[PDB]
C-alpha cells in the first residue's frame, strides 16, 4: 500500500503498449520522423520551433495537451530572449518535469511517452540530439534512433542492426519502414516528418505523398 | 507547465500567464518612420523610410520599419519606435504560434483583426503621447482574383482597421506628402518594378516636406527599405534594387 | 472548456472569461458618418454616408456605416469609427450565439435592450470623446401589423433607449439637417423605393450644411450605403439602385 | 485498485448503451444527420458553427451542456479571428480534451459520445468531414459515416454495407433510417437535419415532418 | 497505520538503491566530484554558486528539481545582501527543510539524496566542507568524504581505508574511481568536475575527457 | 524552497516570490555619468566618467559607470545613480543565473533583450524624472567576422533597443559631444590602444562643453573607467593604461 | 479507531527515545546547555534573545524550524514593545501552542523536545527560570535543571541525586557531564553552551574547546 | 507560530506578516541632526549633532543621532527624526536577527546593501517631504589593511550607496560645511582622538554657518555624541571625553 506507482507505472506501460509505434532517427539530412497513423487530420509528430521537432504515443489528448504546452514554452523562450536560446535540452527537461509532476498528482497518470528532437543551426556542423521522456518522468539523450508506442523489442533490435550514420534519406525512410516491419501491414499510411537542417530557418517539414510513395520500399 | 491559450493565441496566454508583457500593463524617446503600401499585379509592397527622430534631433537613419511578419504578409509600424518594435514582434509570434498549434495559418482577416486587438491595447500609451500605428499589407491566400490578392490596411488608435483598396496608403508623419503624390504617380496594376519605384518615389517627395522623413540621399547612402509580397511569399527587398531604382528617379 | 453564460449572452461571457474584450475596460482617430432610418409599407431601412472624418481631414470615403446584425435587424453607428466598428460585431455575435444557444431569435425589444445594455458599457470612453450612438433598425416578427412591423430605435450615450415612431430618424454630425429633410420629403407608408429615394436626398441635404458628411457626389462616384428588412430579411441595397436613384434626385 | 478507469469506462458505456441511437453521414449536398428522438423541444442535432454541425448521445444534461460550450468556443475563435478560421477540427480536439479531463477528474464521467461535422466553404470543392469522440476522450477522423448510441454493431454493418459517394438526398436519409431499423419501430419520430454546402453562410438546416414524409422509406 | 512514514521511507531507499552512485572527497585543491553517468546531456553535478558545488543521486526531475531550488536560493541571497554571505551551511539547511517538508506532504516522497559541498575563500586557509541531505530531510557534516546512489557499504569501506588529506588531484580521482569499481564496469563514462579552491571567483570547473583520460586509473 | 522560474528568469522568479525587488514597483539624487562605446579590430570597448552630479553640485569623483555584466560582456547606464546602479546588477544576477540553470550562456540579442525588458519596467520611474539608460556591448559569440563580433547596443526610456553599428556610440550628458567628436577622431577597425585612446579623448571632448562630465584631469587625478571585451573576455582596464593614455593626448 | 493520538505520541517518543540527549541547568552564573552533539556546523542549543536561550532534542530539521520561529517571535515582541518585555513565559507558552497545533493537525507529528531558558536582569536578583516543551504541546516550569532526548531515566536520577544550589561553573559542568554517562562514551565531542547572567546584555555565550578541556571530568 | 524569513531577513518577515511596520506602508515634524565619519588608524568613527529642529524652532537638544547597529558597525541618520529613528532601529533588528538565525554576522557589503533596501522603501515619504539619509560607518571583518578596515558609505533617498573612501564624509544640513572643514583639518591615518577632534571641530564650523546645527555649546554643555569602531568593537564616546575635546578645541 505504499508502492501505488508500481501500479501507475503499469497503466502508463499498458496504454503504451498497445496502440501504433514511432521511429525518430539521426541521418545526413537531419532528423527523421516515421510514425504509424492511419488518420490525416490529427497527428504524432509536430513542429516543435525553429529546429525543435516533437513525436509521442500514447493517449491522444493526452499527449496533444503536452504537445501544445511545449511549443507554448518554446515560443515564450524565443519571446522573452531570442529565437536562438530555444534548445532542444530545454523543452526536454521540462517534459521530464511535467510529466513527473502528472504522474505523481494527478489521479490518472498520463499514458504517453514523448520524443524531442533537435537539429543545429543552418551552418553550425553540430550533430541532431534526440530525446525521450516517459510518462513517469524519465529521459535519456540518444543521438541515433529512438523506438516508442507498442511493442518495440522487435524493431528496437531492428533499428539496433541496421543503423548507420550520414545514412541517406531515401535508405533512413526504409530503415526504419522496415524496422515497423518487423513487430506488431504498413502501407504509406503512416505520417512521415523530417527536420531538414539545410533550411535556414524552420527546419521542420512534412513528407506528402507523391513524395512518400518514392521512398517507403514494399516487402 | 501550462497548456497554452484555449483560442491558441499567445497573446491570450500572456494575458493570464505573463500579463507584465502584454502593452496593456505598463519626445521623450525616438518615434517611427515614414511608410508606403502599394497594391500590384503580382501582389503588394510596403516601403520604409530610415529616419528616426526624437525632438528635432535624427536618432537613428538605418532604422528598419518594415516587417515580415508571416509568410504571406508584412506590416510597418510608425510612432514611439520601443513600442512600435515590441508590438509588430509580439504580433510576428501571434500568427506563427497560432499555425503550429493549429496546423494552419490565420485568414488574412483573422490576421488583421489580431493587429487591432493588440493595437486596442496600446491606447492607453496612445493617450499619452506614446502612440503608434501599423500598416498591415498580405497577399489574400483565400482571395479570388490572384490579381487583386494584394491587400492594404490601415489602423486607428483607438483599434480600428480600414481596408484601404485605392490601391496605396501611408503612415508616419510624412504620409500625408507621400499619399498625396501616390495619388499622382500611382498607376494600378503594374510592375513589381513599377510599383516599388513609385514608393522609393514618394519617400523622396515626402522628404521634401517632411523633416521628419528624408527618405532617400545618394550622398550619404541612406536607402529605404522594402518587402514584396506575391503568390511566392514574403520577400525582403536588396538594397542593391533599392539603390538602383532611387538613382533612375533622380532625374 | 467552459459551459458559456447562464444567460446564453456572448457578452456575459466575455464578462467573466476574456474581461478585456469588453468596451467596459479600455479628434484622435477618424469618426462615424451620418445616418437615416426609414419607416415605410413593406418593412423598414437604414441608409449611411461613407464619409470618415478625423479633424478636418477625410479619413475614409467608403465607409460602410450600417450592418445587417441578424436577419431580420441592422444598425447604423456614429462616433469614434474603431469603438463603432467593434460595438456592433459584438452586437452581431451576441444575437447570433442567443439564436445558435436557446433555438430561437431574440425578440426586436429584447435586441434592443441589449444594444443598450452595450453602449451603456461604453460610457466611460463617451465621456472621455470616444464616443458612440448606434441607430438600430428590424422587422418585428412579434408585430401585430405587418405593415407597421418597421422599428426605429435611437440611443443615449449613457444607454437608454428610445422608439422613434415618426417614421424616421438619423444620427451623425448631419443627423440635424438629415431629419430636418425628411420631415419635409417624407411620407408615411410608401415604396421601399420611394423610402430609400427620400433617404439618399436627406443625405444630399446635410451634405449641404455639414462638411463632415457630403453624402452622394456623382462626379466622384461616391454613393451611400442602404440596407431594408421587410417580411423577406434583411438585404443589402446594390451600388446600381443606389448611383441611380441619386441622378434621379437630381433635378 | 488502481483500473477504477475501467468501471468509469463502463459505467459510460453502459449509459450510452441504452438509449436511442444516432447516424451521420456524408453525401451529395453536404452532411446528413439522422437521430432517433421522439421529442421536439429536446434535441440532439445542433448548428454548432457556420459550416459545423454537432450531434451527440447519452445523458442530456452532460451532452447538451458540452453542446453549448461548443458554440461559444466557435463563436470566441469566430470573434477573435474571423469566421473563416473556425474549423470542425479545433473543436473536435477541443471536445476530446474536455471529455478526457471530465473522464479523469469529475466524479462521474461523462455518459456521452459526440460527433462534430465540418462541410466545406460554398465554393471550395473539399469534401465534408466527421469527428467523434468518446466519453474517455478519444477521437477518429471518419470521411464517410459515423454510428454511435444504443447498439452499433447491427446499425454500422447496415451502413457498411450500404453507403456510397455522392449519395442522393433522398437515399441517404433511406440509407440511415434503413440502418436504425434493423437493430434495436422507426416512424417519422425523429430529428432530421443536414448541413447543405449549396447555402452561402448559415448551411445548418433542420427538415420539417412534411419534407421528411417524402424522404422516410417504409418497411 | 501510522508508520506509513516507515513506507515512504522505504520507497525512497530502494529508489536511490538502484541507479549509479557518486563520490564527493575532499583533498589538496578543493573538492572533488565523481559521479557515474553515462549521458552527457544531463548531469548530477552542477555549480551552485561561487563556492559551492551540488551533486545528487535518485529519481532525475526530482533532484533536478531541487538543483535549481538551490541555485535560485543562493543567488537570491547574494543579491538581497552580498556574493559573500551565500554559504553551504545555509543551502544545505535549506535542503534540510525542503526534502523533510516534501516527505511529510507531498503525495510520494522525493527519491533524493543530496550533496552540498563549499570550498573557503582565495585566500581564507580554511578547509572544504561537505554536506548530504537524505529523503527525510536529514543532514550531516562530512570532511571528509561523501558516499551515495546505489550500493554504498562497499564503496563506503573502500574510501574508508583510502583517503588521506592534502590527497593529490590525480590521486584522489584514482581513490574514487576505485572506491567505486569495487562494488556495483567504470570507463570514462562518467561525470568529473571539481571545486578548485585557487580560483577567484565562480571555483566551479568540468573535467573534460581528454583531461580525464590522464586521471582515471586502469583495473 | 521554490522551484525557481520556468523561463530560468532570476527576473521572473522575483516577480512571483518578491515584486517589491523588481524597478516596476517603487534633481534629487546624484545622477549617471557620460559613457562611450567603440568597436575594433580585436572587440568592444566601455569607457566611462567619474562625476556623478546633483543639482550644479559634485556629488562624487570616483564612480565607476561601466560593469562587467557577464564574461563577454559589459555595460554602463547613465541617469539617477541609485536607480543605474540597482538595475545593473540584477541584469548580471539575471545573465548569470540564466547560466548556471540552463547550463549556456544567453545568446548576445538574448542577453540584450533582457535589458531591455529591465528598463521597460523602469518607465513609471522615467516619466517622472528618476530615467536611466544603459549602453550595452559585447563580444557576439555566435558572430561570423571574429573581427566584427563586437557590439553595441543603445536603449529608449520605453524599452526599445537598437543595433548601433556606426562603430561608435554614447549616453549621458556629454554623450552629445562625446558622439560628435568620435565621428572625427574614430577610425573603423583598429588597435585596442587605438580605440581606447580615442575614447579618452571624447571624454575629454566632452568635458570641454558639459559640465556634468570633467572627464581626465590631470591635475587631480581623476582618470575615466574602461573595459574591453575581445575573444578572452572582458576585462578591466588599469589606471595606468588610461592615465597613461590620457597626458598621451594632452598635446 | 479515535486514539489515533496514542499513535501518533509514539512515533513522537519513538523518534526522541533514540538519538542522544541533552542537559539544562541551573547554577551560579546562570544556566548551562550541555547536550550530546558530534558536529559543530549543526546545532541544537542556541540563543533565543537577550536573556533567553534554547536547546532542543529530536529530528532536525523540525526542532531546527522552531528554533527559528522562536528567534523571530522574540526579535518581533522586542520590536514591537521594548526588549525588556521579551520573556522566557511567552516563548514557552508560544511554543506549546504549536507543538500542540501541530501534533493534532500536521500529517506527521513534530518529533521534537524543547527546552526554553531565561535569565534574570544584569542587576536583578532573580533565579534563572526553565519551560520544557514536548511534541504533544505540554509545558513544565523546572527551576533546577532538564533532561531530555534518548533514554532519561538513569541520567534524570544521576542528576535528581546530585544537584546543588550555587553549584560552581566546573562543577556544574561535570554533574552534567556524569549525568550523561551513566545512561546510554563521552569525551569532549559535545555542543556546551551557558546563559551568563554577568553579561549586560547578549548573555549567550558558547563554550570552546580550549576552555572546555578544562572543565570536563574523566571516568 | 511563523517559521520565519526564507532568507533570515526580519525585514521580509514583515512583508509578508506585518506590512504595516514597513517604510513602505505609511516642517510638520522635527528633523534629523548634522553628522559627520571620520575614517582613522585603528577604525572609524560616528560623531553627530543633538539639535533637532522643526521650522525655525528648536524642538531637541539632546538628540543621540549616532546608533551603535552591530558589535562591529554604527550610522547616522539624518532627516525627518521619527522616520530616522524607526529607520535605525529596524535595521539593528535586521542585522541582529541574520546572526541569531545563521549564526553568523552579514559582511558589511551586505549590512550595507541592506540598509539601501531600507531606504529605498522610505522613497514614497521622501518625495513628499519625509526624507531621511543615513550615514554608514563599520569596521570591515574582512579586510585586508587592518588599518584600513574602517569604512564609509553614503545614501540616496532612492535607495542608492555609495563608498565613500576621502577619509571623511557628513550628512545633515551642515554636512556642506562640515565636509568643507575637513576637506582641510583632517589628516588620513591617525589617533582615534586626533580625528574624534577633527570631527567635534568641523561640528563646531558647521554650527558657524548653520542654524539648523549650533554644535558644541560651552555655555549652555550642549555636546556632540560619537561612536567609536575598531577592532575591538563599537564603543559610545564618554561626555567627558567630548567636552573635553570641545574645550581644548577653543583656541
Given at each position: 500500500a505504499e508502492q501505488i506507482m508500481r501500479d501507475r507505472s503499469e497503466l502508463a506501460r499498458k496504454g503504451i503498449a498497445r496502440g501504433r509505434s514511432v521511429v525518430v532517427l539521426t541521418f545526413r539530412d537531419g532528423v527523421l520522423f516515421v510514425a504509424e497513423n492511419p488518420s490525416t487530420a490529427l497527428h504524432k509528430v509536430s513542429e516543435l520551433y525553429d529546429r525543435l521537432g516533437f513525436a509521442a504515443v500514447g493517449k491522444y489528448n493526452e499527449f496533444e495537451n503536452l504537445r501544445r504546452a511545449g511549443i507554448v514554452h518554446a515560443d515564450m523562450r524565443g519571446y522573452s530572449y531570442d529565437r536562438r536560446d530555444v534548445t532542444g535540452r530545454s523543452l526536454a527537461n521540462a517534459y521530464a518535469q511535467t510529466l513527473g509532476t502528472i504522474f505523481t498528482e494527478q489521479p490518472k497518470p498520463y499514458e504517453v511517452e514523448i520524443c524531442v528532437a533537435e537539429v543545429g543551426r543552418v551552418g553550425s556542423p553540430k550533430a541532431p540530439q534526440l530525446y525521450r521522456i516517459t510518462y513517469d518522468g524519465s529521459i535519456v539523450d540518444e543521438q541515433h534512433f529512438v523506438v516508442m508506442g507498442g511493442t518495440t523489442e522487435p524493431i528496437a533490435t531492428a533499428m539496433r542492426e541496421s543503423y548507420r550514420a550520414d545514412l541517406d534519406l531515401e535508405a533512413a525512410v526504409g530503415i526504419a519502414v522496415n524496422a515497423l516491419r518487423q513487430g506488431g501491414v504498413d502501407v504509406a499510411s503512416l505520417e512521415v516528418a523530417v527536420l531538414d537542417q539545410?533550411?535556414?530557418?524552420?527546419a521542420f517539414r512534412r513528407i506528402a505523398g507523391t513524395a512518400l510513395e518514392q521512398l517507403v520500399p514494399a516487402e | 507547465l501550462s497548456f497554452g491559450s484555449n483560442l491558441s493565441s499567445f497573446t491570450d496566454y500572456l494575458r493570464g500567464?505573463?500579463?507584465?508583457?502584454?502593452?496593456e500593463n505598463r519626445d521623450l524617446a525616438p518615434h517611427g518612420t515614414t511608410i508606403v503600401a502599394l497594391t500590384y499585379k503580382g501582389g503588394v509592397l510596403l516601403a520604409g523610410d530610415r529616419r528616426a527622430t526624437q525632438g528635432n534631433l535624427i536618432a537613428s537613419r538605418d532604422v528598419e520599419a518594415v516587417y515580415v511578419t508571416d509568410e504571406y504578409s508584412a506590416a510597418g509600424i510608425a510612432g514611439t519606435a520601443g513600442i512600435a518594435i515590441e508590438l509588430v514582434r509580439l504580433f510576428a509570434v501571434e500568427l506563427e504560434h497560432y499555425e503550429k498549434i493549429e496546423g494552419v495559418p490565420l485568414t488574412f482577416d483573422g490576421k488583421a483583426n489580431r493587429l487591432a486587438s493588440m493595437v486596442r491595447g496600446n491606447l492607453g500609451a496612445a493617450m499619452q503621447g506614446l502612440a503608434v500605428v501599423p500598416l498591415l499589407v498580405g497577399y489574400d491566400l483565400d482571395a479570388d482574383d490572384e490579381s487583386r490578392a494584394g491587400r492594404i490596411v490601415s489602423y486607428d488608435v483607438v483599434g480600428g482597421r480600414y481596408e484601404e483598396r485605392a490601391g496605396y496608403h501611408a503612415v508616419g508623419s510624412g504620409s500625408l506628402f507621400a499619399k498625396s503624390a501616390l495619388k499622382k504617380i500611382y498607376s494600378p496594376d503594374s510592375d513589381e518594378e513599377t510599383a516599388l519605384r513609385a514608393a522609393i518615389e514618394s519617400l523622396y517627395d515626402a522628404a521634401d516636406d517632411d523633416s521628419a522623413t528624408g527618405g532617400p540621399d545618394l550622398t550619404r547612402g541612406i536607402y529605404p527599405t522594402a518587402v514584396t509580397i506575391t503568390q511566392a511569399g514574403a520577400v525582403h527587398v536588396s538594397e542593391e534594387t533599392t539603390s538602383e531604382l532611387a538613382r533612375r528617379i533622380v532625374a
Open positions: 539545410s533550411r535556414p530557418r524552420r | 500567464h505573463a500579463p507584465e508583457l502584454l502593452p
